[PDB]
Amino acid sequence: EIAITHHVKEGHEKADPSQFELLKVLGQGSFGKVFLVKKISGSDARQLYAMKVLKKATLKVRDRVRTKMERDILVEVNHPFIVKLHYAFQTEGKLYLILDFLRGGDLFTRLSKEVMFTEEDVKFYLAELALALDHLHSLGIIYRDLKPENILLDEEGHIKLTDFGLSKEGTVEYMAPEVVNRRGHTQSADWWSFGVLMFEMLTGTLPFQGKDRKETMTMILKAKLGMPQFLSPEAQSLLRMLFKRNPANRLGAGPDGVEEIKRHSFFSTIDWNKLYRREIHPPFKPATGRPEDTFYFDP
Ligand SMILES: Oc1ccc(-c2c[nH]nc2-c2ccc(O)cc2)cc1
C-alpha cells in the first residue's frame, strides 16, 4: 500500500531516532550494523524495517565534503526485486539507513544448506535478478560483487537484491575479464557476474578458481569454461553466451540489453509481466522466525 505512493515520488523521507523502536541487532559486518526496527508514527506506523548504521569516519571525503553515497546511490532505486531506502538521517557520528526487512534469509544460506539449486529455481531467481540489474542499469548503476549473500529472500520466496554492492557505472572470482584488465565495471560486467552466480547456484562451485589471485585472474582471462554435462542445452547455451570474454559479444551487452536475456531459450517458460507483478509463485518458500512456521502442532 505504501509502495504505490513511493512509486510516484523519488528518494527517502526525512526521519529522526524518536520515530523508531529498536527490537534487536540482526547483524554486524565490515559494512556496519543492522537493527530490526519498528516505525512508531505516520502512514506506515508499526511497520518493521531493517536499520543499517554506518560510522561517518568510514565515509569518503571528496572536495573537503564527507560524502554519503550509501544514502544517495539509492535515490532513484525503486523496483520490487531490490531493497528500498525508506528513510535516512544522521547523528553527529552516524548515518542511519532504513530499508526493507526480509525474513527469509539470503541465497548464500539456502545454497550452503542445499548444495545446489535445480534449473527451475535458478530460472526463477535469475529472471527476477535480470529485472533488478536492468533497473539499476537504466540509472547508470552497476553491481560490484553480485554474490548469493547479496540476494535476500522475503517470506513468500521472492528475491530482494541488497544495496551493499551498488556503485555508479571485491571478490576476484566474480570479476569479468575486462574488470581483471582494469577496464572498469560496466553493465556488461554485471552480466558476466550474473553468469558466475548462475554457475554457482547450479553446481555449488565457482567457474574460475585458482591456487592464488594470479591463477584465478589468468583463468578468468584465458581458461575455457568447464561445462557441466548434467545441465540442459538451454542452461549451457546461457552460460556460454554470458561467459564471452569480449564484453561486446556477451548476452545482455547488445543494443537491446536485458531483452537479449529475456528472449533466451533458458527463460522461455517465464511470463515477464506476471514475474514483475509477483504473480509467479516462487518454487521455494523459506523458513522464517514467525511462530506459524516454528511451532509444532497436534490438532
Ligand atoms: O547481516 C544481515 C544482512 C541483511 C539483513 C537484512 C534483513 N532484512 N533486510 C536486511 C538488510 C540490511 C541492510 C541492508 O543494507 C539491506 C537489507 C540482516 C542481517
The per-residue DSSP string of 141-203 comes to: EEES---GGGEEE-TTS-EEE-STTEEE---GGG--HHHHTT----HHHHHHHHHHHHHHHHH
Rounded to 10 degrees, the C-alpha dihedral 268/269/271/275 comes to: -110
Cα dist from 19 to 13, 47, 105, 201, 252, whole Å: 12, 11, 26, 40, 43
- Cell readout for 177 is 575479464
Please give the DSSP secondary-structure letter assigned to residue 106: B
Rounded to 10 degrees, the C-alpha dihedral 155/158/163/169 comes to: 180
CB 225 within 8 A of CB 243: yes
Residue 166 in contact with ligand 1 by CB distance below 6 A: no
CA of 164 to the centre of ligand 1 (A): 9
Annotated binding site: 26-34, 52
CB < 8 Å & 24+ apart, contacts of 79-82? 79/131, 79/132, 79/135, 80/158, 80/276, 80/278, 81/128, 81/129, 81/131, 81/132, 81/135, 81/158, 81/159, 81/160, 81/161, 82/132, 82/135, 82/136, 82/160, 82/161, 82/163
Report how far residue 153's alpha carbon sits from residue 150's, in angstroms, rounded to the nearest whole number: 10
Residue 163 in contact with ligand 1 by CB distance below 6 A: yes
Of 12, 34, 159, which is best to mutate to test ligand 1, by the most ligand atoms within 8 angstroms of its C-beta? 34
CA of 101 to the centre of ligand 1 (A): 7
CA of 208 to the centre of ligand 1 (A): 28
Could you tell me how many residues make up the chain? Answer: 299
- Cell readout for 81 is 526485486
CB < 8 Å & 24+ apart, contacts of 2-6? 2/43, 2/44, 2/47, 3/84, 5/43, 6/78, 6/84, 6/86
**Residue from 104, 81, 78, 66 nearest 11 by CA:** 78
CATH number of the domain within which 127 lies: 1.10.510.10
Tell me the H-state helices in 21-115.
Answer: 69-72, 107-114
- Cell readout for 116 is 545446489
**Residue from 210, 213, 211, 178 nearest 193 by CA:** 178
CB 164 within 8 A of CB 31: yes
| Furthest CA-CA distance within the chain | 66
Where on the phi/psi map is residue 100: left (φ > 0), alpha (ψ -120 to 50), or beta?
beta
Of 68, 158, 162, which is best to mutate to test ligand 1, by the most ligand atoms within 8 angstroms of its C-beta? 162
- Catalytic residues, by residue number, are 145
- Cell readout for 180 is 581483471
Cα dist from 287 to 23, 166, 212, 284, 294, whole Å: 20, 27, 37, 10, 8
CA dihedral sign, ordered 194, 198, 199, 201 = positive
Exposed, middle or buried, 176 (CB in 10 Å: 0-12/13-18/19+)? buried
- For 78, list phi and psi in degrees, rounded to 5: -160, 85
- Cell readout for 299 is 490438532
Residue 74 in contact with ligand 1 by CB distance below 6 A: no
Residues 6+ apart with CB under 8 A from 138: none
Range of the domain at 259: 105-277
Which helix or strand (DSSP H or E) is residue 13 part of? strand 13-14
Spacing of C-alpha 248 from chain mean position: 24
Annotated binding site for ATP: 26-34, 52
**Residue from 194, 94, 203 nearest 136 by CA:** 194
Report how far residue 132's alpha carbon sits from residue 81's, in angstroms, rounded to the nearest whole number: 6
Residue 34 in contact with ligand 1 by CB distance below 6 A: yes
Residue 27 in contact with ligand 1 by CB distance below 6 A: yes
Which residue owns the Cα nearest ligand 1 atom 16? 162
Residue 161 β-bridge partners: 82, 151
Residues 6+ apart with CB under 8 A from 5: 43
First-residue to last-residue Cα distance in the chain: 35
Residue 102 in contact with ligand 1 by CB distance below 6 A: yes
Residues 6+ apart with CB under 8 A from 238: 195, 198, 251, 264, 265, 266
CB 121 within 8 A of CB 241: no
Experimental method: X-ray
Which residue owns the Cα nearest ligand 1 atom 15? 163
Angle of CA points 187, 193, 195, to nearest 5°: 115
